[PDB]
Amino acid sequence: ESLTVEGALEYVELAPQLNLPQQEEDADFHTVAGLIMEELQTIPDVGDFADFHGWRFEVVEKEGQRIERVKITKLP
């Protein structure tokens, strides 16, 4: 599977690689999965997604209640 990360990748680890923008100190999430929950404000099902700074984050696999895998694509 093409362009996917684990839910629990750290923003701090992903972002410098996608040039995502730096976060502030009052950080609301630390992980890809956390990013998704933050934007949605709810428990994402499979195939829920969040758009953020020009990218889309889509939950492809849930293991239980954990977001296991997310698929990163590009927005318009």
- Centroid of chain to Cα 72: 8
Q: Resolution in A for the shown PDB structure?
A: 2.5
CATH class given for the domain over 1-76: alpha beta
Yes or no: say if 72 and 55 are a contact pair by the CB < 8 Å rule: yes
Burial classification of residue 68, based on how many CB atoms lie within 10 Å of its CB (0-12 exposed, 13-18 middle, 19 or more buried): middle
Way the structure was solved = X-ray
One-character DSSP codes across the chain? --SEEETT-BHHHHTTTTT-----TT-S-SBHHHHHHHHHTS-PPTT-EEEETTEEEEEEEEETTEEEEEEEEE--
